Amino acid sequence: PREVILCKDQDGKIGLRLKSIDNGIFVQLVQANSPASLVGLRFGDQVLQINGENCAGWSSDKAHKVLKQAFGEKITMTIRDRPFERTITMHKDSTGHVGFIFKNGKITSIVKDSSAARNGLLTEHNICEINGQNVIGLKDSQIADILSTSGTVVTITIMPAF
């Protein structure tokens, strides 16, 4: 786990939304060019403590409350970098495709005899990055376009959908 110190922007904002999952707190959205992005926060990071207080069991509503009510300009956090993450490298065939359907940023079926099949891609998982590009918060058509334009090698990072 690592310590990070976020400095609030002039607006009072750090550019971070947190979510309650399995009685922990997880990074859910990191805004571009924000205090949160500066210190290297990503979707799926786990927040163990904020200003010395355990996040365990906090609701999403609470976590938002605690960040909003943080006195002062610096907020300290203890982070476990994305603990649930599987990165799979596939390769396009002459479908020009890798072999999967997705919807709302989540994989929904695996095509038989495809590189996604050969490489054990899993359904009910969120797509987080494609070839090093963050796709959290993108539209399905934007993800499809990144896949369409990709070279043969497609490396995807996934997480459980929780």
Added chain:
Amino acid sequence: MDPREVILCKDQDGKIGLRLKSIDNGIFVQLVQANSPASLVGLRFGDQVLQINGENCAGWSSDKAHKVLKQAFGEKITMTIRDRPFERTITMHKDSTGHVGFIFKNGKITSIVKDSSAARNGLLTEHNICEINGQNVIGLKDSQIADILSTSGTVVTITIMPA
């Protein structure tokens, strides 16, 4: 993070000591018998099976996977394996009255106690307990797990996986 190849050999009774289950359009190890061909190649609960005898496991039902293993030529069964892909090991410390600070039921952690070691270390609910202090506890009863945690020394290392 790449897959590994194992070659197993059915034992005198035609068995390898492995039960497989379909999850999320994959195949996962669900139970490894002690002192079996499967344990002796290092298979564990939650390992992912990508290929058996060169055929993709993607989309196979649990019954199909059972059938494939039943029908396979016993002297040489090849499997391509990804080592337990969702796995997190967390180290905790018992407090002055012996508690690490979580409740579990049917082998799944269900509650985290406020201000405990399990809280401080971010233990999660809706996670199956796989090992305690290196010991596999899959298939053990809640009361047997509780026993391993009660009798444990002060340091309690737990390996968990999403359920």
